[PDB]
Amino acid sequence: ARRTWLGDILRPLNSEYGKVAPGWGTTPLMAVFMGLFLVFLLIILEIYNSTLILDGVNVSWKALG
Amino acid sequence: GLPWYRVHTVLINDPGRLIAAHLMHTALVAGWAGSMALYELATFDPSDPVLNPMWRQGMFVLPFMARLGVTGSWSGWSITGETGIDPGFWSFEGVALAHIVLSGLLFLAACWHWVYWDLELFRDPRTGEPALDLPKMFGIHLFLAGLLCFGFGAFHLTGLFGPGMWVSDPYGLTGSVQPVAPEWGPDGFNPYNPGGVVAHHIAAGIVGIIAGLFHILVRPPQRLYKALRMGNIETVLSSSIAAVFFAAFVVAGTMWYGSATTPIELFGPTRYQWDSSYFQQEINRRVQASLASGATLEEAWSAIPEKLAFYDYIGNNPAKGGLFRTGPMNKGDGIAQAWKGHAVFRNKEGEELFVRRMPAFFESFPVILTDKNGVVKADIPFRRAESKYSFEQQGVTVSFYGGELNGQTFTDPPTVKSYARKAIFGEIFEFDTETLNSDGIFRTSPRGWFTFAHAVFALLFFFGHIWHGARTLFRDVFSGIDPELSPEQVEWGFYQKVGDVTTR
Amino acid sequence: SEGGRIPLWIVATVAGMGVIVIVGLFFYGAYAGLGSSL
Amino acid sequence: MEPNPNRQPVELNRTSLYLGLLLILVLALLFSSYFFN
Amino acid sequence: TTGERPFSDIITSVRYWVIHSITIPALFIAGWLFVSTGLAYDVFGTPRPDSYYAQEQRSIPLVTDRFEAKQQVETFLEQLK
Amino acid sequence: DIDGIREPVSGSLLYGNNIITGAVVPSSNAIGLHFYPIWEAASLDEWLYNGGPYQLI
Amino acid sequence: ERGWFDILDDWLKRDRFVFVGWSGILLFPCAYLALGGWLTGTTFVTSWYTHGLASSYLEGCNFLTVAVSTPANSMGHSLLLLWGPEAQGDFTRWCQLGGLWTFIALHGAFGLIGFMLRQFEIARLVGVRPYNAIAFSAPIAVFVSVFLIYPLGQSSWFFAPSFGVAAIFRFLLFFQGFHNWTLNPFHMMGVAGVLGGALLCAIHGATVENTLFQDGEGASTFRAFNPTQAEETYSMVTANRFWSQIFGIAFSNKRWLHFFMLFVPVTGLWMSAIGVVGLALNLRSYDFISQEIRAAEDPEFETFYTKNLLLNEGIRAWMAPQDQPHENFVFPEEVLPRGNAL
Amino acid sequence: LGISTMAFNLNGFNFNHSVIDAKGNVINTWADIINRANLGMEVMHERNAHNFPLDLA
Amino acid sequence: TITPSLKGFFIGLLSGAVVLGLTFAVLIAISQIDKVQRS
Amino acid sequence: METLKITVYIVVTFFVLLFVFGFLSGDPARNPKRKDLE
Amino acid sequence: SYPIFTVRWVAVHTLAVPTIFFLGAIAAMQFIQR
Amino acid sequence: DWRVLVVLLPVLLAAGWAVRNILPYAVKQVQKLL
Amino acid sequence: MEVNQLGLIATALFVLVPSVFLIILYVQTESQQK
Amino acid sequence: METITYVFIFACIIALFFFAIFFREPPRIT
Numbered sequence A: 001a002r003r004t005w006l007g008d009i010l011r012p013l014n015s016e017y018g019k020v021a022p023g024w025g026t027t028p029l030m031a032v033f034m035g036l037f038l039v040f041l042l043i044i045l046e047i048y049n050s051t052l053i054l055d056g057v058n059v060s061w062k063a064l065g
Numbered sequence B: 001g002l003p004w005y006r007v008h009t010v011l012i013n014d015p016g017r018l019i020a021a022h023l024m025h026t027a028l029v030a031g032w033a034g035s036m037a038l039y040e041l042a043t044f045d046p047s048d049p050v051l052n053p054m055w056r057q058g059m060f061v062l063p064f065m066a067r068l069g070v071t072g073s074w075s076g077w078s079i080t081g082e083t084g085i086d087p088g089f090w091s092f093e094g095v096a097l098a099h100i101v102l103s104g105l106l107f108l109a110a111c112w113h114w115v116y117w118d119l120e121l122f123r124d125p126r127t128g129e130p131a132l133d134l135p136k137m138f139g140i141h142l143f144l145a146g147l148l149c150f151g152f153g154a155f156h157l158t159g160l161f162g163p164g165m166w167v168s169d170p171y172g173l174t175g176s177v178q179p180v181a182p183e184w185g186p187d188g189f190n191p192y193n194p195g196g197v198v199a200h201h202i203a204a205g206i207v208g209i210i211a212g213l214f215h216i217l218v219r220p221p222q223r224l225y226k227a228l229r230m231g232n233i234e235t236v237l238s239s240s241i242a243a244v245f246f247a248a249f250v251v252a253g254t255m256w257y258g259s260a261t262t263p264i265e266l267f268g269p270t271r272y273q274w275d276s277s278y279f280q281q282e283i284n285r286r287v288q289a290s291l292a293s294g295a296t297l298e299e300a301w302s303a304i305p306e307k308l309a310f311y312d313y314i315g316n317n318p319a320k321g322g323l324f325r326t327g328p329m330n331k332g333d334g335i336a337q338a339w340k341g342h343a344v345f346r347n348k349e350g351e352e353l354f355v356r357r358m359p360a361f362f363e364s365f366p367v368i369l370t371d372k373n374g375v376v377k378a379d380i381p382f383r384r385a386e387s388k389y390s391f392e393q394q395g396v397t398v399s400f401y402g403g404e405l406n407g408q409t410f411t412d413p414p415t416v417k418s419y420a421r422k423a424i425f426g427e428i429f430e431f432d433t434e435t436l437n438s439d440g441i442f443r444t445s446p447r448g449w450f451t452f453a454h455a456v457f458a459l460l461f462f463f464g465h466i467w468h469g470a471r472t473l474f475r476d477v478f479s480g481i482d483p484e485l486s487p488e489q490v491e492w493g494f495y496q497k498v499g500d501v502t503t504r
Numbered sequence C: 001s002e003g004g005r006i007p008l009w010i011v012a013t014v015a016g017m018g019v020i021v022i023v024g025l026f027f028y029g030a031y032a033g034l035g036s037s038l
Numbered sequence D: 001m002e003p004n005p006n007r008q009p010v011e012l013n014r015t016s017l018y019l020g021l022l023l024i025l026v027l028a029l030l031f032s033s034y035f036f037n
Numbered sequence E: 001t002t003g004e005r006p007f008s009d010i011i012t013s014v015r016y017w018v019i020h021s022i023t024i025p026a027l028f029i030a031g032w033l034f035v036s037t038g039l040a041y042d043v044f045g046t047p048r049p050d051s052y053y054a055q056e057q058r059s060i061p062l063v064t065d066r067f068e069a070k071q072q073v074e075t076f077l078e079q080l081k
Numbered sequence F: 001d002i003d004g005i006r007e008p009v010s011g012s013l014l015y016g017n018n019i020i021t022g023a024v025v026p027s028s029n030a031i032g033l034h035f036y037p038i039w040e041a042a043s044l045d046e047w048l049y050n051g052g053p054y055q056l057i
Numbered sequence G: 001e002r003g004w005f006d007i008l009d010d011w012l013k014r015d016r017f018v019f020v021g022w023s024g025i026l027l028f029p030c031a032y033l034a035l036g037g038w039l040t041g042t043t044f045v046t047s048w049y050t051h052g053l054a055s056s057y058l059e060g061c062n063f064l065t066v067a068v069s070t071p072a073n074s075m076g077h078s079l080l081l082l083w084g085p086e087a088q089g090d091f092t093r094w095c096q097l098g099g100l101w102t103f104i105a106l107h108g109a110f111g112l113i114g115f116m117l118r119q120f121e122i123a124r125l126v127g128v129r130p131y132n133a134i135a136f137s138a139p140i141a142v143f144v145s146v147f148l149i150y151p152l153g154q155s156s157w158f159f160a161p162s163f164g165v166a167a168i169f170r171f172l173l174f175f176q177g178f179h180n181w182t183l184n185p186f187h188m189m190g191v192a193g194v195l196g197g198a199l200l201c202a203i204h205g206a207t208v209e210n211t212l213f214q215d216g217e218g219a220s221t222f223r224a225f226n227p228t229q230a231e232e233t234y235s236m237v238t239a240n241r242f243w244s245q246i247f248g249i250a251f252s253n254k255r256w257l258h259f260f261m262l263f264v265p266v267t268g269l270w271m272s273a274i275g276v277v278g279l280a281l282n283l284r285s286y287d288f289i290s291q292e293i294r295a296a297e298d299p300e301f302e303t304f305y306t307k308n309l310l311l312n313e314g315i316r317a318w319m320a321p322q323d324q325p326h327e328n329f330v331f332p333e334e335v336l337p338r339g340n341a342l
Numbered sequence H: 001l002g003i004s005t006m007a008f009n010l011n012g013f014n015f016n017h018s019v020i021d022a023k024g025n026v027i028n029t030w031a032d033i034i035n036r037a038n039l040g041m042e043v044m045h046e047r048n049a050h051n052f053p054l055d056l057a
Numbered sequence I: 001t002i003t004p005s006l007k008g009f010f011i012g013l014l015s016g017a018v019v020l021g022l023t024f025a026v027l028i029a030i031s032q033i034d035k036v037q038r039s
Numbered sequence J: 001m002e003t004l005k006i007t008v009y010i011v012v013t014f015f016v017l018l019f020v021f022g023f024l025s026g027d028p029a030r031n032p033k034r035k036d037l038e
Numbered sequence K: 001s002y003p004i005f006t007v008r009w010v011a012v013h014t015l016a017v018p019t020i021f022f023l024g025a026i027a028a029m030q031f032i033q034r
Numbered sequence L: 001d002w003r004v005l006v007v008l009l010p011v012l013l014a015a016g017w018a019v020r021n022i023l024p025y026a027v028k029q030v031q032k033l034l
Numbered sequence M: 001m002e003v004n005q006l007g008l009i010a011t012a013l014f015v016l017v018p019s020v021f022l023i024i025l026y027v028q029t030e031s032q033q034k
Numbered sequence N: 001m002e003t004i005t006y007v008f009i010f011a012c013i014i015a016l017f018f019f020a021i022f023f024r025e026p027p028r029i030t
């Protein structure tokens, strides 16, 4: 294959195909972030939906003048 | 050979040519943006932002330019109605040109990457086979996206180094591009607060930078690597398509309901504003405040801006169009010229009467007039023989306050009836139907068209997600199942755990 | 106790008759009391 | 330049041509009324 | 087969029917009483035949406000004297 | 004149129809269940006005 | 690597009478609640406060007229959660406000997700290609377009279909009168896919059944087949000749035949879904402009298209006051559109 | 067979005003809404062809 | 401040968590009690 | 019209006669297997 | 030999128990008069 | 609420009766699984 | 009739473009070595 | 122009029927 200056510079960033951490690794941490993100989406959805209604938060064109 | 629907699969193990095909796609999209902006500039009439704004003229990319701060033409005009403005290079024309040149450079890069496909960069150093390290690539790209998202937020939207964004008053009368500070309290999650858009790009930008660094530095767990087939580029296609249909549903929704990023001065008003008489309530409030301050009826109504009256008209309601009724809103009811003023109907007893407005559901609707307490007082009858509410029987008249017909009164049944028929549409306007040969049939706005296209494309992309996820997780059987599939593997009870040969 | 003592054909017959009876009751109810139009 | 080993011939058999043409033509016969409006 | 006792075994056994000749009529009677005592009406808020309208009213009790809807239903209910 | 009330309905392409609106229109209510072949008409113009093509087809 | 996850995985995939799976955790509760909500609502729950209708067995409705009806128009697109701001944790009030409608719609949606995940999971365990799930994408596009996107585009959940036989019939007629839905080429493609699918089902079944090889002595021919047999049970060659001579063309490739049987009804349903997304926005195929210009100028010009529009106008005027009670429509007799005598 | 028996006017189930309260007020069901739609269709179809109050074919 | 709807939100979140947790506790327990036989 | 009518009657008669005399020309024997069905 | 309380037992009863209850309720309804 | 007791009482006696007939085999099934 | 003036070319290209695509693929399949 | 278009598409379809039946690739038993 053809080498080039730039390809030589970028080589290390494409040299670890298939490399994995043992077992479950950071899955538990990932799960937690997924759970937080689900709740964040439910919050913003319920706000837009007026199912969750917060003081100072007027979901309307008449929010701020 | 390959069937027609598989021709592009030749790219799966050829990162150079895949990059070339992507460069070519990008070139075509940038080229589209350039061409679209040019067509719109060649057809847009900037002379009346009150009764002929961009959303009445079928403008689709112009409001997206305006939304982020491009409001002027090299020709001297601006979308807010100013004269003698100098926009610098970044006028609508400059944006279009920039997109064309970008398109060109991308095309050339595509050619280079297509010829010189066999770069050593694309080979796995240990096997010599083509390979992309997708997890690290995801980190790299996420980091980049994070820096850009953050930059956009902290510099562009804030006006720190940039123009800001389109903002307006609650009735879409005084819109302009303004610098916007981030909103860090709970109101940042209010769709109608622009400060939340700012805050979002700052915070999510930061989170993108952090997650990016994580994904650059930390390898996937073996179990997730295997489960999601992280060695197969089609897994990335599957999940990317999922993310994309999610984003598309969200933009369709925020376009339909409105938010700080889908302003009515750029896309037209929403159907819900007609549904709840939003503009009518504001108009009546203003008129009452004037009356209470000692104004005459004529003065009260003459004090209503034409733009505001224009919002209170069903011809601008995005839920009144048709799938094959093509073009700009102007092609239907015509190009709006002037507010006729507010029509007040009275019967022979001098009681004020109110025309029943058309709900969006109805292509056609009767003409029925009630008193302030909803009692029917007059109508236009179908069968005449037992009519009791005809305008003729009831002596219905109509007087105008404000607008072109201000101070005038009409008593002849044909005229009164004509105005009543217009009154079902809300406030009444004079239109030029000749310039464009308008056919008098309602069309939706860019709010409508955008919403439609994006809900449909999102729904289709769901199928895309299902198809590619399936191809990813069932790669081993996509030319068929094992010819030697033992019957006992699908026979009930033989294995304790379905399809697990260790559990006989 | 052990499966078999009560012949399956009798079970099917009795169950079926039961089904017929209840649906019959529902059709009677179409003509009397609520929903009867009377 | 060395040839690309990922190239593949493409095919469309006659039945597929006929099915394709029937699809396009019927789709046209259907949508044309709406294009003319 | 997947390990569980065949249905045809079960429903032709004496024990099944010793249990179910009690359990099946009991449930049926319970459902009957749920209606006959009038409990169902109160649980689900379904109008009895004499509770759709007040004596002289002929207008439907339609809910017209989202956030005070509960109070509106309570008011409609109060209006049946 | 599908309903026999001298109110002719246009079904053909050349007379203002598209593929979606077009039709061969049922024979006249004045005819009812009577057999109306071409030779029962005084002329093809008559046959056509009364919806003869429908019965033939 | 034998941790709790793998042990649970073991349990979930036991070859038992009703397969569970990881997908079962989503599917079973959601499907059960959706069916239970419908049975519960149609048996006991009114629509007096939301629609001014009786809708349950308790009130005197029959199987054809029971329904779980949509919430009042004033609820907008409220998720209408039991603990939400509308019902405030009050179960009786929740039923009276139409909470069972969103309960059923939402649990049903997650249940359909569960079922398609089940099709994937089982395909993967057994080792077959996942075309059954893929084909199930069409029911999903239909449910999502009709029960969610369509009313989300309109004023409120009120205009979603209500869950009941007659209620659905009302949905059909409403779509005719207000949307002219039969005129829509997306609906039309849907019709072609459904009827074409039914046609393929029938013709394929009958063809197989009538080109059977005699593989046994009996005059009832079902027993002369064995699941494990390698041989085709009917003659593709004879089938092919018969159809080539009858209809001019015939299948010759069984794999293509079966794929086509997937393709036709799945594609049809997908097209119908697209048209409904348009109707969410009233973006209808309601008119042909050329027709209307000609007709408006020429009082002798009449087509089946104009006739159908007069029918639609009748539907809107005569059905609206009772079908849309929140609008408080009062249409005096004299304004009602009517032909002579009727 | 539905079409072929409705041909002789044995029609769909009719539950118009089947549900009635204690006083005798009509309590509408979805069947009655269907009825209103059907009325729109009925009163509009063939707008010039009927001279008498009942459409008997 | 905690509005009645934010309180309600909390209640719904807690209810969901409880249903999910109870479900998984039970499934895990049963999975532990009734293990598959392997060679 | 009369010429048209006679013509059409003759055509119809011709084909109907073909149908009838045709199905009378030993049709059960026109099959691939057991022919002697008289 | 065979277990009694299985997953199948549970599924069967989650359907059959409310069904018989519901059928008793609907039966009682047939005797309600306005 | 007396109506609630009147309705649940049938089901309760049903449950209790089915436990009486199946308890010996239930304890055998469970003590086998363990 | 006052039809849309783009309908003719819309229809023509709608037919022509994909049909030509299919014809190109068909002919070059045929010309491949038998 | 419209009528010509509709009739033309139709005509192409009938021609296609002709080719698809009489000039199909013959089915061959391998």
Ligand code: CLA
Residues within 6 Å of the ligand: A041, A044, A045, A046, A048, B183, B184, B188, B189, B190, B191, B195, B196, B197, B199, B200, B201, B203, B204, B207, B208, B245, B246, B249, B250, B254, B259, G144, G148, G149
């Ligand atoms: C405090 C800092 C901060 C602030 C003030 C904001 C502010 C905002 N965020 Mg951001 N965000 C932040 C940090 C912040 N963010 C961080 C750190 C992250 C993680 C990187 C995000 C990730 C994020 C996401 C993923 C989204 C937002 C969105 C928003 C906007 C929400 C209002 C809205 O229009 O919702 C509208 C959107 C919803 C209500 C979400 C609906 C979710 C759907 C219903 C789930 C189901 C999808 C499925 C396909 C639906 C199919 C069914 C249907 C078709 C029937 C608002 C500008 C939303 C947005 O972009 O709006 C335009 C959005 O989607 N943010």
Ligand code: CLA
Residues within 6 Å of the ligand: B039, B040, B043, B057, B058, B059, B060, B323, B324, B325, B326, B327, B328, B445, B446, B449, B450, B451, B453, B454, D027, G267
């Ligand atoms: C997101 C996509 C999108 C959207 C929402 C808009 C929106 C708009 N465009 Mg723009 N435009 C776009 C992309 C878009 N455009 C592209 C890609 C081009 C290049 C061709 C253009 C070029 C363009 C021009 C030249 C003009 C517009 C105009 C407009 C305005 C009028 C729209 C209209 O009448 O549509 C009508 C929409 C339809 C008739 C829908 C067609 C649906 C197809 C036919 C369905 C096909 C079904 C399929 C074949 C079935 C396959 C079945 C098989 C799978 C089994 C509107 C604001 C007009 C304007 O007013 O400018 C000022 C105008 O003159 N646009």
Ligand code: CLA
Residues within 6 Å of the ligand: B004, B005, B006, B007, B008, B009, B237, B241, B460, B461, B462, B463, B464, B465, B467, B468, B471
């Ligand atoms: C990011 C989006 C994306 C990308 C990069 C791909 C990429 C791929 N798809 Mg997937 N797919 C997607 C989204 C995507 N798809 C979506 C949204 C759907 C549902 C519509 C599908 C449904 C799908 C199926 C059923 C199949 C694929 C297949 C493929 C592979 C071969 C495609 C090919 O050779 O077609 C060649 C295409 C042509 C020669 C002509 C297509 C003409 C189209 C149909 C009409 C005109 C399209 C127009 C130019 C598009 C304008 C842009 C649009 C956004 C408006 C390729 C890896 C195939 C595969 O898996 O091979 C193993 C395959 O069978 N895709």
Ligand code: CLA
Residues within 6 Å of the ligand: A035, A036, A038, A039, A042, G025, G026, G029, G030, G033, G079, G080, G081, G082, G083, G099, G102, G103, G104, G106, G107, G110, I010, I011, I012, I013, I014, I015, I016, I017, I019, I020
């Ligand atoms: C397991 C499958 C399943 C799924 C997917 C759903 C889904 C749904 N249910 Mg259903 N339901 C289920 C089983 C399920 N249910 C069961 C088994 C029952 C019987 C108890 C019910 C009874 C039920 C009722 C009575 C209602 C619903 C409703 C709903 C909807 C609203 C749910 C919600 O907002 O949760 C919010 C909670 C979560 C999403 C939990 C997320 C878990 C997080 C990530 C963990 C962190 C929690 C945190 C640490 C706790 C802090 C709490 C503290 C601050 C107080 C949603 C569609 C509502 C509805 O349909 O309205 C129309 C409704 O009224 N469900």
Ligand SMILES: CCCCCCCCCCCCCCCC(=O)OC[C@H](COP(=O)(O)OC[C@@H](O)CO)OC(=O)CCCCCCCCCCCCCCC
Residues within 6 Å of the ligand: G205, G206, G209, G210, G219, G220, G221, G222
């Ligand atoms: C005896 C009941 C007959 C009912 C009417 C006919 C049903 C079957 C006809 C369908 C034709 C399909 C095209 C040919 C399909 C075809 O070729 O069939 C072939 C198939 C198999 O043929 P065999 O030659 O093996 O057997 C038929 C004879 O030769 C006798 O052995 O025929 C049958 O299975 C007959 C079944 C009789 C019993 C069927 C009852 C099914 C319906 C029961 C009533 C339900 C009504 C519900 C209303 C709510």
Ligand SMILES: CC1=C(/C=C/C(C)=C/C=C/C(C)=C/C=C/C=C(C)/C=C/C=C(C)/C=C/C2=C(C)CCCC2(C)C)C(C)(C)CCC1
Residues within 6 Å of the ligand: B028, B029, B030, B031, B032, B035, B100, B101, B102, B103, B104, B105, B107, B108
């Ligand atoms: C080379 C070069 C250059 C140039 C460039 C250029 C000139 C470019 C252009 C470009 C362009 C100019 C492009 C364009 C594009 C476009 C597109 C890409 C489009 C597409 C479209 C579509 C795809 C559509 C579709 C559709 C239809 C048609 C109908 C309706 C529906 C839909 C929408 C689907 C320069 C000098 C700069 C420099 C460098 C070199």
Ligand SMILES: CC1=C(/C=C/C(C)=C/C=C/C(C)=C/C=C/C=C(C)/C=C/C=C(C)/C=C/C2=C(C)CCCC2(C)C)C(C)(C)CCC1
Residues within 6 Å of the ligand: C019, C023, G032, G033, G035, G036, G037, G038, G039, G040, K014, K015, K018, K019, K020, K022, K023
């Ligand atoms: C909603 C809800 C819920 C749930 C509930 C449930 C889950 C329920 C279930 C329920 C059920 C589960 C019920 C059932 C029922 C059943 C029935 C009612 C049946 C009937 C049947 C019949 C009547 C039959 C008929 C027939 C047929 C079908 C065919 C054959 C013949 C005959 C005619 C016999 C909860 C609490 C969670 C929460 C709150 C809300």
Ligand SMILES: CCCCCCCCCCCCO[C@@H]1O[C@H](CO)[C@@H](O[C@H]2O[C@H](CO)[C@@H](O)[C@H](O)[C@H]2O)[C@H](O)[C@H]1O
Residues within 6 Å of the ligand: J017, J020, J021, J024, J025, J026, J027, J029
């Ligand atoms: C109203 C329409 C006229 C109705 C008349 C009905 C009258 C009933 C008797 C009709 C005469 C039947 O005459 C019938 O036709 C021809 C005449 O050569 C005979 O001849 C036929 O015999 C063999 C039978 O294997 C055929 O293969 C052969 O092609 C043909 O020649 C039939 O064997 C004879 O049975």
Ligand SMILES: CCCCCCCS[C@@H]1O[C@H](CO)[C@@H](O)[C@H](O)[C@H]1O
Residues within 6 Å of the ligand: B086, B087, B088, B089, B090
């Ligand atoms: C592609 C050709 C490049 C032509 C560049 C013209 C620059 S034009 C120049 O730009 C400045 C920033 O926009 C403005 O401040 C200034 O008013 C304007 O005249």
Ligand SMILES: CCCCCCCS[C@@H]1O[C@H](CO)[C@@H](O)[C@H](O)[C@H]1O
Residues within 6 Å of the ligand: B074, B075, B086, B087, B088, B089, B090
């Ligand atoms: C590639 C050739 C295109 C070169 C176009 C350069 C436009 S440059 C542009 O010109 C305007 C004059 O009206 C000024 O208002 C503006 O400030 C200036 O940037």
Ligand SMILES: CCCCCCCS[C@@H]1O[C@H](CO)[C@@H](O)[C@H](O)[C@H]1O
Residues within 6 Å of the ligand: B334, B414, B415, B418, B419, B422, B428, B429, B430, B431, B432, B433
């Ligand atoms: C004889 C009619 C006298 C009253 C005038 C009609 C109502 S107002 C009228 O409405 C038209 C659309 O129909 C517009 O095109 C026009 O601009 C406007 O004058």
Ligand code: OEX
Residues within 6 Å of the ligand: F003, F029, H045, H046, H049, H055, H056, H057
């Ligand atoms: O024709 Mn046709 O439609 Ca059987 O009803 Mn009578 O007629 Mn007429 O009216 Mn209704």
Ligand SMILES: [Ca+2]
Residues within 6 Å of the ligand: B437, B438
């Ligand atoms: Ca004109």
Ligand SMILES: [Ca+2]
Residues within 6 Å of the ligand: H022, K033, K034
């Ligand atoms: Ca009484």
Ligand SMILES: [Cl-]
Residues within 6 Å of the ligand: G307, H044, H045, H046
């Ligand atoms: Cl008619």
Ligand SMILES: [Cl-]
Residues within 6 Å of the ligand: H049, H050, H051, H052
């Ligand atoms: Cl008459």
